[PDB]
Design a protein around this nucleic acid. Structure first.
Ligand SMILES: [Mg+2]
Ligand SMILES: [Mg+2]
Ligand SMILES: [Mg+2]
Ligand SMILES: [Mg+2]
Ligand SMILES: [Mg+2]
Ligand SMILES: [Mg+2]
Ligand SMILES: [Mg+2]
Ligand SMILES: [Mg+2]
Ligand SMILES: [Mg+2]
Ligand SMILES: [Mg+2]
Ligand SMILES: [Mg+2]
Ligand SMILES: [Mg+2]
Ligand SMILES: [Mg+2]
Ligand SMILES: [Mg+2]
Lengths: 57, 260, 188
RNA sequence: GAAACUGCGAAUGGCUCAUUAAAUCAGUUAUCGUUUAUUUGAUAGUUCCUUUACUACAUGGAUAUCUGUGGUAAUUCUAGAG
RNA sequence: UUCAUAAUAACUUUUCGAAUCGCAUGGCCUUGUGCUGGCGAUGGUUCAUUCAAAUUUCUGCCCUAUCAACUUUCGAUGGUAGGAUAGUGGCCUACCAUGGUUUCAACGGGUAACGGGGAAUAAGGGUUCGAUUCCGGAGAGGGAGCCUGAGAAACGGCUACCA
């Protein structure tokens, strides 16, 4: 499903629609207020460090 | 219900507005201020029904916004300020100053007062008390509190007030044989002398008050306002001068005086 | 919730007055504070006319006061020693108005060491005349002296600690002091 | 000057008569038994804490509207970052 | 009056005592940009007043004895203390006393009863009516509970349960 990625300093942010399920399975069973790695999320993201905060059912 | 009331319905409008039965569901509620709801007079009634300087409420509102109107020195932009008894209303355009004084009937009157005397406002007591910093202070039934009064300004005794500055010019004591104006329902706006003061423990102080014509009458103290000593009242009063004639007497004066 | 209605109470004779109107705010009376002595806490409450009316909660300390001298201090409380309404408030240790209580008494000593400086329980040249001019004024009423040595005087708090927030009270002296001691020996 | 926070107002008016029979309500008092924004009158050299080098000519970081990043089948639903 | 108010003693999860804003640009030179000062706004303290607010005094209701006793275990009546409340109080709690009302109708029931102002009728005395333009009181489908707020037990606020 969709993701809601947002860079602080630059102020540049984007839609990343994800149909592939393995990409989304990293975030499962985490809580709002944690850090995530770039590599396991996808092939386009590598070396990045996300921070899971926020979401919607 | 659920706290204070904001409207005032015209039939409930206190009669001495002489508000018109028709031409409005409501009356102007006299706003909060120095004088009690029914004992006040809101300016809309004053400027429109009485003086007719405005033809409607709109024009009164604007009249207050331009602002020559000055009730007791200060300006007011309030359409329904409680301009009560003694309240010196000065309109600087026209120079038509008015003190607020009761016609013998009871309903308030337009008294087209001098420059000049409309400059002090007579005012009663109320208190005598003291406040913080041990300051002795006096209060006027007719609104204001004045600090540091002469120790022998006692209760139900008048005080002349400088008005523009707001201090004490002078005071009239309350006692036997002193010209006294009246502000109580049936005897409202009569004038007389004072003979007795029935003391009464708890149940209201009474005062037996003979007019010029020497028709005696009684009131309560709270509804009595000492205008001076006999002969010289400190305020200029309207034609009639607190006499209050009989019904036939008024009918006599009207149908005698026919000057076309 | 807990209202103060004259509406309820059946009536003077018995006539179970019917429930005229749903009870109103202006009739209300909130939950009882029954403040303890266990870690100083206070919550305020928005009462009629705004008014922050501080509700004391587990209040430690209060300025309990002499009579003879005319003094009070930052004085620690110990416990609810006797409450003449209900003994329920003694064991639960809930502080309340007119409750007899024990006062740490160290501040009552430390200040007494200046005031007179004669000591209770058992330097500089011009002060010795102020020391001499003062003292032998109040001899103190025995129980208070022994309680001074105990480190535990008998006050009888007179603030309303659910209304006030402050837990400020009054050292017992003389007859009432002599009375509440008999009740403390009766209870114990 | 849109938007928004702050302020104030929305406890007024309006409708109705179910309850309710010493209750309501009318006059009568009282509050030396109380709250009262508003109202118009009043008004706070003492915050310092030893007194030979100290923020005061101005202390702090937030949060909204915004910038986008969005969800939903719906809704005067609003989550994250700057 | 234990009032106003003033003192001695302190406290206190030490309230308040403007790190606020728009128009006006004056007065002395120790010639700095110095020190100074007008007309207003809001705010802010308790005292006042007003709008009010809660209680409360007295007296006053329609029918029914085919309601003569009722209230008091589960506050009834009083007291002492507290608790609460803005505050008075059986308003609540403890301990105590046994009161309280009643044929001068207590209590109970009924009301196709909201109260009053008033209305119709209309010699006098009256009867019946008053949902309804004003004044009170209630209610917002029921019954509860509460947030904010000076003021709400708000419902063109919310929480819930029933319908
Ligand atoms: Mg209403
Ligand atoms: Mg009196
Ligand atoms: Mg006093
Ligand atoms: Mg106040
Ligand atoms: Mg009590
Ligand atoms: Mg009915
Ligand atoms: Mg009726
Ligand atoms: Mg009616
Ligand atoms: Mg009906
Ligand atoms: Mg009505
Ligand atoms: Mg309906
Ligand atoms: Mg409700
Ligand atoms: Mg409504
Ligand atoms: Mg509605």
């Amino acid at each position: 499903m969709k993701l809601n990625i947002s860079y602080p300093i630059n102020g540049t942010q984007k839609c990343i629609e994800i149909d592939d399920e393995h990409r989304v399975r990293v975030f499962y069973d985490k809580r709002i207020g944690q850090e995530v790695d770039g590599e396991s999320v996808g092939d386009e993201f590598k070396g990045y460090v996300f921070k899971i905060a926020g979401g919607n059912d | 219900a659920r706290g204070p009331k904001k409207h005032l319905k015209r039939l409930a409008a206190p009669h001495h507005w002489m508000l018109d039965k028709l031409s409005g569901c409501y009356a102007p509620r006299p706003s909060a201020g120095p004088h009690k709801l029914r004992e006040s007079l809101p300016l809309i009634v004053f400027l429109r029904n009485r003086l007719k300087y405005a033809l409607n409420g709109r024009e009164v509102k604007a009249i207050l916004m331009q602002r020559h109107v000055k009730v007791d020195g200060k300006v007011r932009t309030d359409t329904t300020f409680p301009a009560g008894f003694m309240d010196v209303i000065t309109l600087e355009a026209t120079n038509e100053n008015f003190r607020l004084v009761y016609d013998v009937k009871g309903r308030f009157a337009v008294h087209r007062i001098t420059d000049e005397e409309a400059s002090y406002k007579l005012a009663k007591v109320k208190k005598v008390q003291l406040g913080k910093k041990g300051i002795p202070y006096v209060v006027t039934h007719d609104g204001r509190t004045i600090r540091y009064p002469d120790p022998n300004i006692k209760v139900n005794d008048t005080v002349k007030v400088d008005l523009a500055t707001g201090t004490i010019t002078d005071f009239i004591k309350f006692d036997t044989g002193k010209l006294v104006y009246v502000t109580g329902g049936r005897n409202l706006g009569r004038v007389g002398t004072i003979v007795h003061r029935e003391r009464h423990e708890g149940g209201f102080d009474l005062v037996h008050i003979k007019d010029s014509l020497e028709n005696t009458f009684v009131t309560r103290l709270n509804n009595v306002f000492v205008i001076g000593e006999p002969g010289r009242p400190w305020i200029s009063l309207p034609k009639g001068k607190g006499i209050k004639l009989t019904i036939s007497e008024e009918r006599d004066r009207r149908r005698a005086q026919h000057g076309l | 919730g807990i209202s103060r209605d004259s509406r309820h109470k059946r009536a003077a004779t018995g006539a179970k007055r019917a429930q005229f109107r749903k009870k109103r705010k202006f009739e209300l009376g909130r939950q009882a504070a029954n403040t303890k002595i266990g870690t100083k806490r206070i919550h305020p409450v928005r009462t009629r006319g705004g008014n922050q009316k501080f509700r004391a909660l587990r209040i430690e300390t209060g300025n309990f006061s002499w009579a003879s001298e005319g003094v009070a201090r930052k004085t620690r409380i110990t416990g609810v020693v006797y409450h003449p309404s209900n003994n329920e408030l003694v064991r639960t240790n809930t502080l309340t108005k007119a409750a007899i209580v024990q006062i740490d008494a160290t501040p009552f000593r430390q200040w007494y060491e200046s005031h007179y400086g004669q000591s209770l329980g058992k330097t500089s040249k011009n002060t010795e005349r102020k020391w001499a001019a003062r003292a032998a004024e109040a001899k103190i009423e025995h129980a208070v002296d022994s309680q001074f040595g105990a480190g535990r005087l008998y006050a009888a708090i007179s603030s309303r600690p659910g209304q006030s927030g402050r837990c400020d009270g009054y050292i017992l002296e003389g007859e009432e002091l002599a009375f509440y001691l008999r009740r403390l020996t009766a209870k114990k």
